[PDB]
């Protein structure tokens, strides 16, 4: 599966390691939120990450379906 990732600093799409067929987004607020917006975390996983208090989580299976908010899922 090809998936957006926040590892690189110009966010790119990468083929994911074997066994990890899932994409995910995570979004929440820092103490920098009012001046930088919400934190964004992108990558792959074997199972979807558990949700904690006050954060969004998205999952999917097609390619590039976890885009940056300022981006589109092309």
């Amino acid at each position: 599966i090809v998936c957006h990732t926040t590892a690189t600093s110009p966010i790119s799409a990468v083929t994911c390691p074997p066994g990890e067929n899932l994409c995910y987004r995570k979004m929440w607020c820092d103490a920098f939120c009012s001046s930088r917006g919400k934190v964004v975390e992108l990558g792959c996983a074997a199972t979807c990450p558990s949700k904690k208090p006050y954060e969004e989580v998205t999952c999917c299976s097609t390619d590039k379906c976890n885009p940056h908010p300022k981006q589109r899922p092309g």
Partner: antibody, heavy 126, light 108 residues
Framework: EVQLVESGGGFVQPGGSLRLSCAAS????????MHWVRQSPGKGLEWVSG???????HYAGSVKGRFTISREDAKNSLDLQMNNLRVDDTAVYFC????????????????????WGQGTLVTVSS | EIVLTQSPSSLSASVGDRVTITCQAS??????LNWYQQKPGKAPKLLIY???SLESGVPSRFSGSGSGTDFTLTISSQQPEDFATYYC?????????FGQGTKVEIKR
């Protein structure tokens, strides 16, 4: 797992030379701002040098003109050449990665120091 | 250069105590302050950034308050794992600077 390993520390006479090398596992350090922070009793934790995510070198005042930092691609390592060493440079030297956080506004570097190496000792004495 | 001074330098506490360390800067740094934990013979570990945000994996009993020149690190329920030396670090101006450090010792 992500980790930092540093080497080259030792024990030299004032005016001598040393070279510290730092390698990473789990990430490419040229993606991040790398730093060197030294620790000794009498001066505490002190920022020393830095090689940012663009290849630029940075140095603290008390060490500029004597230290040099560079990517050595053929070694997959971060090197710190320490020349004209003096006694107060005796400390434990840490190789450190700066945090790279993504927001809806962009990427922000070195807000903090998230990954620290184990530390290598540098002794300068008569 | 911005100067950081922690208070106190040493403090005793029992398991279950509420521990409070303060950190003061030579001028305003907004909330660009980090907190690190260090055990002897070991590298420091990042605990707080942005003066208040916990780094992933850190237990929620840690909390950080403060903006401007006065900052606070608080352990609500002291555990044995939490006996170490704590450092604050500012990331507002260059160069980065740390406090002298504060050791949390076991009361008996």
């Amino acid at each position: 797992e992500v980790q930092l390993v540093e080497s080259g520390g030792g024990f030299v006479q004032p005016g001598g030379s040393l070279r510290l090398s730092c390698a990473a596992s789990g990430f490419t350090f040229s993606n991040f701002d790398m730093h060197w922070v030294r620790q000794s009793p009498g001066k505490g934790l002190e920022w020393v040098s830095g090689l940012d995510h663009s290849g630029g070198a940075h140095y603290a005042g008390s060490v500029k003109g004597r230290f040099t930092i560079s990517r050595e691609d053929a070694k997959n390592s971060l090197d710190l050449q320490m020349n004209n060493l003096r006694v107060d440079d005796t400390a434990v030297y840490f190789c450190v990665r700066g945090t790279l956080y993504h927001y809806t506004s962009g990427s922000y570097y070195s807000d903090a120091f998230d990954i620290w190496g184990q530390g290598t000792l540098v002794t300068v004495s008569s | 250069e911005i100067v950081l001074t922690q208070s106190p330098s040493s403090l005793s506490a029992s398991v279950g105590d509420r521990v409070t360390i303060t950190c003061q800067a030579s001028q305003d740094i907004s909330n660009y302050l980090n907190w690190y934990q260090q055990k002897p013979g070991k590298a420091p570990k990042l605990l707080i950034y942005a003066a208040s945000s916990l780094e992933s994996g850190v237990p929620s009993r840690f909390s950080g308050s403060g903006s401007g020149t006065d900052f606070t690190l608080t352990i609500s329920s002291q555990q044995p794992e939490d006996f170490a030396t704590y450092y604050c670090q500012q990331a507002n101006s260059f160069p980065y600077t740390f406090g002298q450090g504060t050791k949390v010792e076991i009361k008996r």
